[PDB]
Design a binder for this molecule. Structure first.
Ligand code: NDP
Ligand code: TOP
Length: 276
């Protein structure tokens, strides 16, 4: 449905020039602000350049100012990154990005309901967040050794729970495969229901409503602060422990698309630029 694919990456000599393009599908580039990011080898993703919805404002990161220029062709539904005077430090995977909404209310809800609790998440969700959640014991499930010694890495559901210790509540924070496993064990669901019709590749497991009793619920219209209407909800299991799940669900239980939340943004595949 919605898809971005970059091209133009190449091996290029220092001082040379390159032009990246990002072909968009499923939406018009001139309706949203488009952004370029890049991730140098074994480094964290950084923002490179962006262009506003109307095409009037172009912003650049310090290290590329005067060398890169972003532009777009409304007809070809494509964004471009002209890169000149390439430096070896420009070496990275370059990623196209579209900003289709924001929902800070859900992130405030998430923070408020997880601070001072341990959080369990799968490896893909760790990658989607990209950073430890401060003020929380982070527990990541993965069959493979960890890659970040700031968080606790575990190899099984039972170890994840044991890693939490004796706490009154454990928060399972995603993603789809992890939710499936912890749903049968959960006493409580914190849900954000988002009024967004999006396809994704990750879903919240179907929970049966008669299994669950709503103890809190609160609908908020969309406005200039949250671009989709949303409804917070807290459910308790009829006939239950300390395990809670917290998740934000768009229509039909979609929770994710390529390690991002599709009510807010979509990412491209990335194109490799090597300056050497
Ligand atoms: N809207 C929302 O509320 C949320 C949305 N999301 C979205 O969900 C998507 C990711 O969900 P998903 O793709 O399901 O991946 P998950 O985040 O559930 O993590 C999957 C990985 O976790 C590890 N894992 C899971 N169970 C076990 C186990 N029993 N023992 C060992 N390792 C285990 C494996 O890692 P390995 O392969 O290393 O063994 C597995 O591949 C992303 O798009 C993200 O944006 C994420 C969080 C919340
Ligand atoms: C703190 O930032 C993120 C948090 C989450 C997890 C999460 C986010 N919102 C809700 N309601 N439940 C969750 N389990 C997921 C994210 O990406 C999928 C985040 O980055 C945007």
């Amino acid at each position: 449905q919605v898809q971005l694919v970059e091209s133009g990456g190449a091996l290029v000599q220092p001082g040379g020039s390159l032009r990246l393009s990002c072909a968009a599908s499923g939406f018009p580039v001139n309706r949203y602000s488009m952004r370029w990011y890049r991730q140098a080898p074994g480094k964290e993703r950084e923002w490179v350049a962006g262009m506003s919805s109307a095409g009037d404002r172009s912003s650049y990161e310090d290290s590329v100012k005067g060398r890169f220029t972003i532009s777009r062709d409304d007809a070809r539904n494509t964004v471009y990154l002209q890169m000149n005077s390439l430096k070896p430090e420009d070496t990275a995977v370059y990623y196209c990005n579209v900003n289709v909404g924001f929902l800070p209310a859900d992130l405030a809800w998430f923070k408020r309901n997880t601070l001072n609790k341990p959080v369990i998440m799968g490896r893909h969700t760790w990658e989607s967040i990209g950073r430890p959640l401060p003020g929380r014991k982070n527990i990541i499930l993965s069959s493979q050794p960890g890659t970040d010694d700031r968080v606790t890495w575990v190899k099984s559901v039972d170890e994840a729970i044991a890693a939490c210790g004796d706490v009154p509540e454990i928060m399972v924070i995603g993603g789809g495969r992890v939710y499936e496993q912890f749903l049968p064990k959960a006493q409580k669901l914190y849900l954000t229901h988002i009024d967004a019709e999006v396809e994704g590749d990750t879903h919240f497991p179907d929970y049966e409503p008669d299994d669950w009793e709503s103890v809190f619920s609160e609908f908020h219209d969309a406005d200039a602060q949250n671009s989709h209407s949303y409804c917070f909800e807290i459910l308790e299991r009829r006939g239950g422990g300390m395990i809670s799940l917290i998740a934000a669900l768009a229509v039909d239980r979609v929770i994710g698309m390529e390690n991002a939340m599709p009510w807010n943004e979509y990412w491209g595949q990335g194109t490799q630029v090597t300056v050497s």
